[PDB]
Design a protein around this nucleic acid. Structure first.
Ligand SMILES: [K+]
Ligand SMILES: [K+]
Ligand SMILES: [Mg+2]
Ligand SMILES: [Mg+2]
Ligand SMILES: [Mg+2]
Ligand SMILES: [Mg+2]
Ligand SMILES: [Mg+2]
Ligand SMILES: [Mg+2]
Ligand SMILES: [Mg+2]
Ligand SMILES: [Mg+2]
Ligand SMILES: [Mg+2]
Ligand SMILES: [Mg+2]
Ligand SMILES: [Zn+2]
Lengths: 46, 118, 178, 83
RNA sequence: ACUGGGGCGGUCGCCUCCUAAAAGGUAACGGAGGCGCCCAAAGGUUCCCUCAGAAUGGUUGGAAAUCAUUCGCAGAGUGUAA
RNA sequence: GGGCUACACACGUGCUACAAUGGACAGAACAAAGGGCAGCGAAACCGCGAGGUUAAGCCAAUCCCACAAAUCUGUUCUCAGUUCGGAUCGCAGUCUGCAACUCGACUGCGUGAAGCUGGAAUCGCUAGUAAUCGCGGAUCAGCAUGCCGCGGUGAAUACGUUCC
RNA sequence: CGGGAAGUAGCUCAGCUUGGUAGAGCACAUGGUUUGGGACCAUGGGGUCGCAGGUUCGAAUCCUGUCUUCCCGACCA
RNA sequence: CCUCCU
């Protein structure tokens, strides 16, 4: 990672309004999604 | 805010902004907001996460977007497959509902392609 | 992150038993993830690359390299050395961090999502999936995007065959078509 | 769309012929002029030869064809482009 | 001026190949092509590298743009003719 | 039974639009002229609605069709192919009719096309006219943007006769 | 026989020399105008550049061959 | 500018 040229990349925490929570690495400090793997129906099954 | 996989207009009122979802018009947008209990005058940008949540749950029951688009597609596909008169009108790009075709079938036909008269 | 820890503790022991390998060294892993944006409209519009980079920069988290034309092609009005794309290679944490967000968050936001295809292995256990909208990625804001544009996402693995690669990807949360 | 209170329409003559075949496992071409008759569920599998105006067009019935009038599968006009 | 008489047509210096008879050389108005430059790097050096094409997968994107894997004495490249 | 309803296309006559002198929503209003006997059908109840069930009155200055709508006053939208426009198409209905596939009208929900005031050219109108807004009727089971009537609001301009 | 020059829409011609865009006039088509023509006005459409091969990322354009049509030359005996 | 024949 040659310094300067890249963006700032750090802890994130994603949050489904549906309730799921976990911390990836990303640019945004607080990511807030309105859908994820646990809420979406293809994954869950309907 | 994204609703049913569609970023609706933020600056407009919610009754109007909900109609940007495929499968929702003014009456459906009224009847969801009623059920949610959100005011029709409120802007999308000035909704709470409570309000959006309640709206999302209602719209998730309603058949919208690709769910609806697939249904419509198969309906039209069925008519073609069986070889119904309507199916023949669908594929040939002509009126399907008895509209006369000697004149004024331009929505189906598309723009004019002029040919030399006698 | 969780997926790297999940891989080492859960997936790799399962695959050992599943395929009945002699060594743990035979267990397939994800080598790298190359995200490619082809930008052929760079021929017409000069700023197409500059925009496409900025999108890919935030999605991946590394500065992309700008790919250039290997040949001149008349059909596309392409000359040799023209910028017509941008790739970024992801390995290690930046790879797993990305792949977690892809499966957990981004692929759900795909409009009318009904799983990614089981057909799209290369025949030697590498998977590629075509994204259409860059709006699915949570780093991309809706308002800032003007030109809509997708990408290829190659998942390279040490699986020799597709069925071994398929298993590995299924053991990760990746939503394969039922 | 015919009223639900009335229920789906079919000519007695047509229905009687197909019901007569449904008594057994008989399958024959039921030539008819009743284009207005709805295709009932119990028509499925038969080959009703519907009169188009000048000839009896043979129409093999399917599940998807149920609901539709027999005339919908026997188009009256002949068109194959100008020039 | 050359010239299978002269005129008329064509040619005239340089480079590469064949004719050229396995050293070199070798003629004809014999057979084929190039040149009268270009490059401030397309030069020097140090360090690193491998090409054409095909198959398969993949958003836009096609026969063919960029991405990935595999096969791959070279089927490429080497400013320009050989 | 089908066709007169075809559809590469060209013309005539119209309807609806292209929006803020507007759209949406809400509250006040103010007509005329007609039609009605197996016909008009109130009210009531049910249905989001088209309508349905039931049924008062009236062979009518008595009852019914019948609700005027533009307008006025609020509220909202704030110039956008949109809260403009409503074609086209999917689904589900209603009614008439023996029967609405070819080929009915209307309703609900969804869809949301072209269209940003129209080239050459060309039409009507001199006043309760033009323009615009509804209403009724004949034909008719059902089916009118057509036709024949009806009132509401209500302009501009005419110097002049050269030219067409 | 030798040497030139053309060959591009239905017809007549530009574009070729400088490689990236197929143009122009008449004609044709539709509308308008007229009782109807003509003329006039408005609005369109039409080749893929003789054929083949080559060079080029790319050919109407550069190179070669071929075909067709013209033009010039064929002298001293 | 023209206006088929009887
Ligand atoms: K001689
Ligand atoms: K160097
Ligand atoms: Mg009709
Ligand atoms: Mg001499
Ligand atoms: Mg001589
Ligand atoms: Mg000479
Ligand atoms: Mg020798
Ligand atoms: Mg030698
Ligand atoms: Mg007629
Ligand atoms: Mg509207
Ligand atoms: Mg007068
Ligand atoms: Mg009537
Ligand atoms: Zn979730």
């Amino acid at each position: 990672m040659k310094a300067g040229i890249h963006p700032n990349f750090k802890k994130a925490t994603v949050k489904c309004a549906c309730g799921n929570e976990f911390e990836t690495g990303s640019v945004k400090e607080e990511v807030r999604v309105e859908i994820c793997s646990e809420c979406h129906p293809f994954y869950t099954g309907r | 805010a994204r609703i049913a996989g569609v970023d609706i207009p933020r600056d407009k009122r919610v009754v109007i902004s909900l109609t940007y979802i495929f499968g929702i018009g003014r009456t459906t947008a009224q009847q969801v907001l009623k059920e949610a209990g959100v005011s029709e005058d409120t802007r999308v940008r000035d909704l709470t996460e409570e309000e959006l949540g309640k709206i999302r749950d209602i719209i998730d029951k309603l058949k919208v977007e690709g769910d609806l688009r697939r249904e419509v597609s198969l309906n039209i596909k069925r008519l073609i497959e069986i070889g119904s008169y309507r199916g023949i009108r669908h594929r040939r790009g002509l009126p399907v509902r008895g509209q006369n075709s000697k004149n004024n079938a331009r929505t189906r036909k598309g723009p004019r392609r002029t040919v030399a008269n006698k | 992150n969780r997926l790297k820890e999940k891989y080492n503790k859960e997936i790799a022991p399962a695959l050992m038993t599943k395929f009945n390998y002699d060594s743990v060294m035979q267990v397939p892993k994800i080598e790298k993830i190359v995200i490619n944006m082809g930008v052929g409209d760079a021929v017409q519009n000069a700023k197409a690359i500059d925009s496409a980079v900025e999108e890919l920069t935030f999605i991946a988290g590394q500065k992309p390299v700008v790919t250039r034309a290997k040949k001149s092609i008349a059909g596309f009005r392409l000359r040799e050395g023209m910028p017509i794309g941008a790739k970024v290679t992801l390995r290690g944490e930046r790879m797993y961090d990305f792949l977690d967000k892809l499966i957990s968050v981004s692929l759900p936001r795909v409009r009318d999502f009904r799983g990614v295809s089981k057909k799209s292995f290369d025949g030697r256990g590498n998977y590629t999936l075509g994204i259409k909208e860059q709006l699915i990625f949570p780093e991309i804001d809706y308002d800032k995007v003007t030109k809509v544009r997708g990408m290829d996402i190659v998942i390279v693995t040490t699986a020799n065959t597709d069925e071994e690669a398929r298993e590995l990807l299924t053991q990760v949360g990746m939503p394969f078509q039922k | 769309a015919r009223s639900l209170k009335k229920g789906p329409f079919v000519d007695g003559h047509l229905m009687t012929k197909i019901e007569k075949l449904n008594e057994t496992d008989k399958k024959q071409v039921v030539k008819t002029w009743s284009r207005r008759s709805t295709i009932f569920p119990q028509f499925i599998g038969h080959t009703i030869a519907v009169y188009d105006g000048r000839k009896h067009v043979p129409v093999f019935i399917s599940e998807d064809m149920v609901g539709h009038k027999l005339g919908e599968f026997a188009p009256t006009r002949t068109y194959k482009g100008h020039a």
